[PDB]
Paper text:
Human osteocalcin (bone Gla protein, BGP) is a useful biomarker for bone formation and bone-related diseases. The anti-osteocalcin C-terminal peptide antibody KTM219 is a representative Fab fragment applicable to the Q-body immunoassay. Q-body is a fluoro-labeled antibody, single-chain variable region (scFv) or antigen-binding fragment (Fab), and its fluorescence intensity increases when its antigen is added.
To elucidate the mechanism of Q-body, we tried to crystalize Cys-tagged KTM219 Fab (Cys-containing peptide tag (MSKQIEVNYCSNETG) was added to N-terminus of VH) chemically modified with TAMRA-C5-maleimide (Biotium, Hayward, CA, USA) using thiol target labeling. Therefore, we grew the KTM219 Fab crystal in the presence of free TAMRA fluorophore. The crystal belongs to the orthorhombic space group P21221, with unit cell constants of a = 66.19 Å, b = 69.52 Å, and c = 96.65 Å and contains one Fab antibody fragment per asymmetric unit. Although the overall structure is almost the same with/without the addition of TAMRA, the CDR-H1 and CDR-H3 loops of VH near the binding pocket have different conformations. However, we did not find the electron density assigned to TAMRA. A detailed comparison of the structure with the addition of TAMRA and the structure complexed with the antigen shows that the CDR-H3 loop has different conformations, although the overall structure is almost identical. These findings suggest that TAMRA does not tightly bind to the specific site on the antibody and that weak interactions with TAMRA may affect the structural conformations of the CDR loops of the antibody around the antigen-binding pocket.
Residue numbers in the entry:
A (entry chain H): 1 to 52, 52A, 53 to 82, 82A, 82B, 82C, 83 to 99, 101 to 127, ...
B (entry chain L): 0 to 27, 27A, 27B, 27C, 27D, 27E, 28 to 211
Write the structure that this text describes.
């Protein structure tokens, strides 16, 4: 029954605004309050504010008063949150939540990424191998936005693969590694290729990795 | 200011089928004037939204397994999980909605315990392709280790490198319960070509003492 369907990811620049939405169903929209929550690496989980759709009354975490604005639209059973004058401190996942009495489920979250950076494909560099088990990989460098995907030998190779989370470099571009450990004695017998894909730029690269 | 909720422990290793106990302390009384105590417990799985397990102290949310139980009062609260299973792994948060502004604890990670495993360490020089293009990334891989805590230290001709490296860590392995970590050291092409000994030193509980992997260019 109860569902909170939030809007998709947002990539916007500093000073810009965004408006997030949370379409509800499976309960009487007008009879329960709606809350928004921020989740960020820097501050963890924070309650932003609450709104009563019945009369539009709202109540804020003083920290977000003015920055966040809560509104509803009854016709569509949708709640909104407007964020203004965005800084990189506003880069976070934002959740919308129902009253506990209707279940108190949360929407799936909407990710807001505040950046200047423009879309850009990665360069792919080999992490070549050099007793018993060897390691090798690909460095997938200087792309925006997330995600990139990496597989090994067209999905055929999965055992011992670790694809690390991306890090945001001070340049405002991302970088990550994907590694695999293979048996030492296969090197020069067995070919290894990382299959890299960055859909936002349409950058697809298959990179062979060797001694 | 805001009510602070302090969780303990920060990380709780357990074995499947074990009992787990997580606590949450409040800087103020969470007893409301209506008699209720608005202290709630959530589980967040990786890449998912927080899920409510227990609300207002001990009310078990409809469809949440009875293995989860919430107790305590005033300012001291405990979540108990009687026979931990795969589905229960993730970060547990307490929160309070007694006093505006509503606040959240910092979370307690529930993870799988295993025997110490020393990381397998590998260093990778920058590729000639990358150097062509004007940057040098040096990569140090720490592979399949437990516990999570590991210190990586980059040294360039014995100069301790500080603030020019970045680490990334994988989620705990679904099969073998280990972690892996990569650390990337970034230099200019010019600076990389000024030095010889690139060295990654790894300190880990699973090792007799710090291992070093180096290469000379």
């Amino acid at each position: 029954q109860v569902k909170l369907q939030q809007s998709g990811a947002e990539f916007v620049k500093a000073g810009a605004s965004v408006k997030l939405s949370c379409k509800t169903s499976g309960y009487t929209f007008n009879n329960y309050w709606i809350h928004w929550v921020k989740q960020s690496p820097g501050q963890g989980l924070e309650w932003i504010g609450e709104i009563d759709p019945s009369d539009g009354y709202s109540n804020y975490n003083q920290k977000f008063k003015g920055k966040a604005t809560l509104t509803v639209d009854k016709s569509s059973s949708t709640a909104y949150m407007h964020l203004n004058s965005l800084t990189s401190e506003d880069s976070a996942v934002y959740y919308c939540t129902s009253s506990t009495s209707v279940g108190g489920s949360w929407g799936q979250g909407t990710t807001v990424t505040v950046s200047s950076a423009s879309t850009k494909g990665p360069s792919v560099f080999p992490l070549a191998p050099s007793g018993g088990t060897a390691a090798l990989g690909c460095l997938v460098k200087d792309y925006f936005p997330e995600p990139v995907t990496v597989s090994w030998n067209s999905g055929a190779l999965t055992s011992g693969v670790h694809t690390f989370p991306a890090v945001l470099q001070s340049s405002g571009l991302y970088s990550l590694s994907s590694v695999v450990t293979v048996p030492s004695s296969s090197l020069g017998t067995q070919t290894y290729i990382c299959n890299v894909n960055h859909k936002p730029s349409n950058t697809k690269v298959d990179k062979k990795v060797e001694p | 200011s805001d009510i602070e909720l302090t969780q303990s422990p920060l990380s709780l290793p357990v074995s499947l089928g074990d009992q787990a106990s997580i606590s949450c302390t409040s800087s103020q009384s969470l007893l409301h004037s209506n008699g209720d105590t608005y202290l709630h417990w959530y589980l967040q799985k990786p890449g998912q939204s927080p899920k409510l397990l227990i609300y207002t102290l001990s009310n078990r949310f409809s469809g949440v397994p009875d293995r989860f139980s919430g107790s305590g009062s005033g300012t001291d609260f405990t979540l108990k999980i009687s026979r931990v299973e795969a589905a229960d792994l993730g970060i547990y948060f307490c929160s309070q909605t007694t006093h505006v502004p509503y606040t959240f604890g910092g979370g307690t990670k529930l993870e799988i315990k295993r025997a110490d495993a020393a990381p397998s360490v590998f260093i990778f020089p920058p590729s000639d392709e990358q150097l062509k293009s004007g940057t040098a990334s040096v990569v140090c891989l720490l592979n399949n280790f437990y516990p999570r805590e590991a210190k990586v230290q980059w040294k360039v001709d014995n100069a301790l490198q500080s603030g020019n490296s970045q680490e990334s860590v994988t989620e705990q392995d679904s099969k073998d319960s280990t972690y892996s970590l990569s650390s990337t050291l970034t230099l200019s092409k010019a600076d990389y070509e000024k030095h010889k000994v690139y060295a990654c030193e790894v300190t880990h509980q699973g090792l007799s003492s710090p291992v070093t992997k180096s290469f000379n260019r």
